[PDB]
Each structure stands twice: as C-alpha cells, then as structure tokens.
Structure 1
C-alpha cells in the first residue's frame, strides 16, 4: 500500500512499503540493559530497559548495605542493541503529478542495519508505529500529533561446464565479437576491439595495469552511440556519460558542499 495512503488505522499493523533510500544514519547505540554500580559498596546489578525507561533501583540491592540513592549508571558497561534510521522517499511511480513526493523515516535494528545504501530501491515489511514528541526537552509536555515511522522486520531490494565447453570452440573470437551487438550492422573489427577491451590485460606489482582504451570517431549520426550503450549494458560496473557538463553526474572528481565527490571516471 502507498506511503501516501497510510492513515491512523495502521498505527499498530504490520504493513508493506516500497520506495527509494535517500540516506541512513550511522549506527545508533540503543540501550537494552542498564548496568548499575553502588557508590559505597561497589556491588553491581543489571537492569533490563523496559519500554525505553530505565527502572533505576532506589536503594542498593544488598540488604547488608541498602544505601538509598547510591546506585549510579556505568554507561560503558551497559549492553546496547544497534538501531539505525533510514529515510525512504515515495517512489515517483506512485506520486500524483502535481506535488512533491512524501517520505517516511524507518527504524531498523541489529543485523538488519545496513541492509541498504543510498540510492537503493527497496521493499520493507514492518509494523507501522507512532510516538509523541516533546515541545521542549526540559518538559514532559508533548505535541498533540505523533511522529510516525515503520519499525521493520524484513527488507529486500527492488556455469563452469558450459564455460569450458564454449572455451573449446575455434570460432570463439568471431562468435563473441558479433554477440556484443548483433542488432548493429557489420563493423566487425570495432566489435573485436571492444570485446578485447572487455577482457583487458593484467596488473603487476613493483604501475602497469590491464586497462585497454578505445575511441570511435567519424560521422555523428551512426551506430557508435548504440555501441557505447551495449558495452555499458554488458560491463558489470561501468558508466555512461558525455564529455562535458553535469546532469548531477560529471567526469572529474570535484570538491563541493564540504565534501569530495568522485566523478564518472573514478
């Protein structure tokens, strides 16, 4: 169901959402067990955190000590779970055409932390939750409408025999070369060159490296653009770009706000 379709009947149900990850926090430590130590007698006791509240012992547990207000919290001996907050934007497939996309913050825990990264389109299954937020930290006073978030419980994105058999072939060079772009009429030495570029040479320690570099020139209204598109589709981790400007993607590494951005070459 749509992120835009959620309503207060959902406030404790297990829901399903689809959308785009904008960013995530670093891992946030979330206390699961407080660890208390007695100032006078150095006795220690573990207290589970209940509904986010520290159930502080008012007096020391040991009846032979039983001093009031003497227990103190030892922060770095408490036990912490992992929490992370991720901001999920409404996918443009679902938006009405005349307004901004919505977004929902989602909380994700333990080994589900870093299930996704910025730019990932995902599904999540999670309980829709809501909580109040304060008017000011020095007061208990709460605003009369709650923050909403989804508290996730599942996330999801969006052979050798044949290899050696084909490797026995005699026509393999021509077979593979024509296969990179069989929709394109014969330019076969270009196709062979680009296949050899896909394979590449080798590296060495000492630098000399396995890169192979190719250029196509000649008339503009011809198959070279389609050829670049096909090798882009074939290669595992390459990119497509053009020699100047930036449609939020540019060639060179570049300093901007302060952050270094890596360009298309990098």
Structure 2
C-alpha cells in the first residue's frame, strides 16, 4: 500500500504549519512566513526540513515518508495552491490570484535528517528519500526533455495536443475530425513541441565515491563546477546505474562550547597554552608553534587573500616532518604531497575536452583540490623547475592560466602552502650567507611570508632537557576543542586594522629596509600575520600589540638580530664592554633621578617608565647600600 494517507497527512501538515515553534525564540515560524510567501512571486517554497526533526509528529511523518516522498510533494503542491487561494480571497487579504491559480507549484525540503550512508544503502532503500554531501566537479549542457507532443494531420492540417504520462508517447491512430477519418495521418512537428531542461551533474560524494546526479527544471545550472553541495533527494537505480534525483540542493555546537571558547580565550596564558597543546611530541619551539598556528588561522580575505605560507629551513634532523604530518591530520582536511613526488600536471590538473559535454573538463590535481584548505609540500627543495613555475602565479594571484592546443582557460587554486626544505648540503652552514644556504631562487624565496631557521646546537643541558621531555612520554587541550576553536575563529571574527596599528607598519618596514633583501613581499606578511593574530585573540580589530608581535615573529623567523648585515652569516652564540658602559650609564642616571625628585625614594615601576621611555643596576646599588 501507501504510507501516505492523503487526508491524514494533509491535516497533519496543516497542524504543523500553524503550530510550530523552535522550542526571541517564542514566536511562531510559519505563522510569520505564510504572509511573506503570499507576498512573494516565487514558484516554490524551501521547506525548513529541520523542523521535521524538531517536532514529534513530523519525525513520525519522516519515518512514514521515507518510502513515499512523491505523494506528499504532490499533495503539498495542491495544499500550497489552496492555502494561497484562502489567504488571498477567503481571508480577503489580497487580490492577485489568477496566475497563482493557473500555475503549478512545488516544495523543496532542504534539511532532512541524513541516512546511513551511500554504500550502506540496500536495494530496498532505492526510491527512498536520502540526504548526502560532497563536492561538485562537472556539469552537462542543457538537455531538453519532452513534456508536450504537437501532432498535425498531414492531409487536413488538424492539430492535436498529446502529453506524456509516465514516459509514454501515444501516437493518435486516426484524425479526430468527423469528415477526415484517414488513419495514421497524424504527424509530429518537432519544433512546435514543449520540453523541459534536464542536466546531469557530477558530484564527489562523501557518505556520513563519485555519484552522477540528475536535475530538472530550475535546478539546472544552479549547481556548477566546484560547488560545495549537500543533497536532499531520491536514491535511484532503475532497470541499474546509481544516481540521485535531486529534490533540493544546499550550497554550503552549543552555548557551553561558546563558554569554553570564551574561558580559553580569556586566560592570560592563551598563546602559551595553544602552543603547548598543539604538538606534545615537539618540545618548545614557541615561534614555530605560533607561526604554524597563525597559518591555520589565516588572514582576512577581501576583494587580497590571507593564505599564509611558511618554509622550514632547519637542520635535516629537527622534527619538521612530524609537524607537517600532524598538521595534515589536525587541520580541516587537505592534501599531503611532496615536491619530489609531484609534477606540474599532478599539482594543477589534467584538462581535456569532451565529446559528450562539448566543453572543457578537469581532473583536479592536489594543488587545486586544496582549494580553501591547507596543503603540505615536503621536499620543496626537490621540486622540478616546471612544477616550481606553477607556484609563482598560485602565490601571486591564486590562479593558474593555461594556454595549449585547443585549451585556453584559468583555474583557481586558493590554498595555504606549508613547506619544508633541507639546507644546501648535509647541514646548514653559517659560514655562508643565509641566501646561499637555501636552494630556492630569489624570486621564489623572496615571496614567502615566514621562513624559519630551526637549527640544532650540541649542548649537554638542552640535550638533557629534550631527552627528558621525550623519553618519559612513551611510558605505559583536546584535538576536538582545538578544531572547534579554529573553526569558530574563522567563522566569526573579521578584524579591521586600526590607525595606530597601521602607523607602525611604516616604521617597521623602513627599519627592515634600511639594513639592505627587504622587498615589498614581506609587507604583505606584515598585515597577513597581524590579521591572523587578531583573529587568534578573537579581538574584532587588529591591535598595535598584535602588529608588534607579528613583526617580532617575522624577525625571529628570519633571525635578523643574529644575522651579519655585511655578509649574511649567522653568529654561533646567538659580558661585553658595551654592556658595561650601558649598565654604568644607566646606574649613574638612575642614581641622579632617584634623588632629583623631591622624595628620598620612589616606586620602581615609575622609575622604569621614566628612564626607559634596570633591575640588575638597582640590585647592585642595593648591594652597595646606595
């Protein structure tokens, strides 16, 4: 039989349509939306199918409906028409009825509860209402589908209107006119018929493999290449290919979670706690932790993306592969690749025409597949030159333009790149300039945001610290909260740079400039990192402290303070006569100031603010009883 009782189901949906509320949350939902829908000239209503799970009788309706969506939709069409007629003329609230009266409507539920997954669907689950998710790849051109047949009698020009019922064409046997009774005289005029748009769309599905969906009517060309899509429709296999008849398509936490986020954000050790909890297997490296976490936060996107890219140029025994392999798993899912094991086609795409589609199609590579996410590239120093040439336009415009035989098109590859590269030779050698220690040409090396020189120094004390950190770990914030925080910050905060924060950029860039490799590329980072820091703080604007911290992070990553300005070499060690002179002058000045004021003593904070605009000098003076 049928699980849908026409009168019972229409009465139940009438009761739901007039009584639903979510639990200001107290106001009724469709009691408000009915007037708006009567105002609208639209031909369809997107039914909020999450309300079906929020209310009991509608959950029962879903369980009954799982096998018979079409009957309920067909009933709801007439129900919508009747409701419109009533609210217009029976309630005497409106008078525009004729076109609504004559036309046909539909309804599309868009938030139905999900099923058990595509591969788990059984042969009896065919023709059931289903809900799925994935990413769209390809689209077929508009294909007309027959609805009306226009037959003309080839001996008397009489015309008959014939329509298709359940995919059946019925050719009239004889002319219907009283005089003209010639059999088989009816003929079809191809271009006087009526058709409707049908389109096949390819979708890479991920159950809660690729599935080729089918769409009809206004659903065509609403889904295009690269769309992030959730599907509500019918799973189909007919005498047997698997395909989905789409009924609606979607183009796209607790308050306790908000309380937890606020608590973690408010505590003063926020940065320290984040760095400490991101990677337990990697000890210390505060700057590297801050940089990679900032890359995960990302900058603000304006129309000017915020895709921060970081290069690790440490010694070839420091934990760097362990960080990237972990990032590949903790971040929202991306693609893990290696420069040595990649090619230009492997990153960008394979592109070719199609006979059936009559337009270009793409076999997406990892670099384009990472659109909107994060990609990891080990062996960045070993990437082929032709492949490296792709990175240029990717990092400069987030696009890839190709012009070859019969194909001229551009593809978007907006993604963040985290890369590791061993130094030239078996180890980093500070006896050579820092530029000469990296095997990347200046045009590619100069456009990164952060480059980290994670060197290894042999020292018994630090070796003991690391060994005691590691050896006791394998005896015998959670990642869920970390991902929750990362998603929330990207979801909500859009920080704007303040005037004071803007002003310091000029001085910082000029200071980096006057020590001349301080190209204009690093000035992009001087805002990209600042916006990411503001997002991490969850502050709605970029603070001057955020800018100063970003500048400090860049300086520490590059390690300019330990870098020789004359030859680019690095000091190994990073009591001096300049230290002695500074301490002596500071002690003299504070000794003068502490008694120049009309008091025998003063607070040390006020003295520090007066002089710096210290502790060792005052401690030594106290040792001398001054």
TM-score tier after normalising by the smaller chain length? 0.5 to 0.7
C-alpha spacing 1:18/1:183, structure 2 compared with 1 (3 Å): same
Is this contact kept in 2: 1:243–1:251, CA < 8 A? no
How far the C-alpha of 1:259 sits from its partner, in A, is: 8.2
C-alpha spacing 1:62/1:121, structure 2 compared with 1 (3 Å): same
Is this contact kept in 1: 2:132–2:205, CA < 8 A? no
Choose 1 or 2 for highest CA Rg.
Answer: 2
C-alpha spacing 1:248/1:131, structure 2 compared with 1 (3 Å): farther
Q: Write the deviation string for residues 186-206 of structure 1: whole angstroms up to 9, x where unpaired.
A: 99999999999999999999x
Q: Given the two structures, how large is their TM-score scaled by the length of structure 1?
A: 0.53
2:276 is aligned, of 178, 181, 187, to 178
Q: Which stretch has the larger CA shift, 2-11 or 76-85?
A: 2-11
RMSD: 6.6
Q: Which protein has the bigger helix share? A: 2
Q: Which stretch has the larger CA shift, 236-245 or 18-27?
A: 236-245
The runs of 5 or more residues in structure 2 that have no matched partner are 1-115, 354-359, 367-626
> How far apart, in 2, do the equivalents of 1:210 and 1:252 lie?
20
Q: Could you say what secondary structure the match of 2:119 adopts?
A: helix
How far the C-alpha of 1:29 sits from its partner, in A, is: 0.6
Is this contact kept in 1: 2:117–2:207, CA < 8 A? no
C-alpha spacing 1:92/1:32, structure 2 compared with 1 (3 Å): closer
Is this contact kept in 1: 2:136–2:225, CA < 8 A? yes
> How far apart, in 1, do the equivalents of 2:152 and 2:125 lie?
42
Q: Given the two structures, how large is their TM-score scaled by the length of structure 2?
A: 0.26
> How far apart, in 2, do the equivalents of 1:201 and 1:127 lie?
40
> How far apart, in 2, do the equivalents of 1:203 and 1:21 lie?
23
Q: Which protein has the bigger strand share? A: 1
Q: Which stretch has the larger CA shift, 238-247 or 29-38?
A: 238-247
Structure 1 residue aligned with 2:364: 262
> How far apart, in 1, do the equivalents of 2:311 and 2:352 lie?
31
Matched, 1:252 2:359: no
Is this contact kept in 1: 2:236–2:245, CA < 8 A? yes
C-alpha spacing 1:243/1:56, structure 2 compared with 1 (3 Å): same
Structure 2 residue aligned with 1:73: 188
Q: Write the deviation string for residues 25-52 of structure 1: whole angstroms up to 9, x where unpaired.
A: 1111100011111110111111111111
> How far apart, in 2, do the equivalents of 1:261 and 1:11 lie?
30
Larger RCO, structures 1/2 (Cα 8 Å, 6+ apart): 1
> How far apart, in 1, do the equivalents of 2:265 and 2:135 lie?
41
Is this contact kept in 2: 1:125–1:152, CA < 8 A? yes
Q: Which stretch has the larger CA shift, 241-250 or 105-114?
A: 241-250
Q: Which stretch has the larger CA shift, 104-113 or 151-160?
A: 151-160
Q: Could you say what secondary structure the match of 1:88 adopts?
A: strand
How far the C-alpha of 1:86 sits from its partner, in A, is: 1.5
Is this contact kept in 1: 2:136–2:201, CA < 8 A? yes
Q: Could you say what secondary structure the match of 1:186 adopts?
A: coil
Is this contact kept in 1: 2:132–2:206, CA < 8 A? no
